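User: Can you predict the 3D structure of DNA repair protein REV1? Sequence below.
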Amino acid sequence: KIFKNCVIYINGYTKPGRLQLHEMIVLHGGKFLHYLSSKKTVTHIVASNLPLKKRIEFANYKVVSPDWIVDSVKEARLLPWQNYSLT
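Assistant: Sure. Here are the predicted structure tokens for DNA repair protein REV1:
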């Protein structure tokens, strides 16, 4: 349960796909959102890249590549989000 206390919102197209990532998230203790509510709930946003508008919309969120999830799972430990930050 490496993703305990993580609440993840996936934005845009990703590899692996959102459904596969959602499985990995809930399989390892975390939650995901279908709708980006606010920073009250969301702990991390996952995205492959960010058009300027999204870089503005998601400023001061932790925005990380999907590798963060994949790599943390393979290592069986929560890797530092900063290593995978887009910004």
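Helices lie at 18-27, 52-57, 67-75. Residues 3 and 30 are 4 Å apart (CA to CA).
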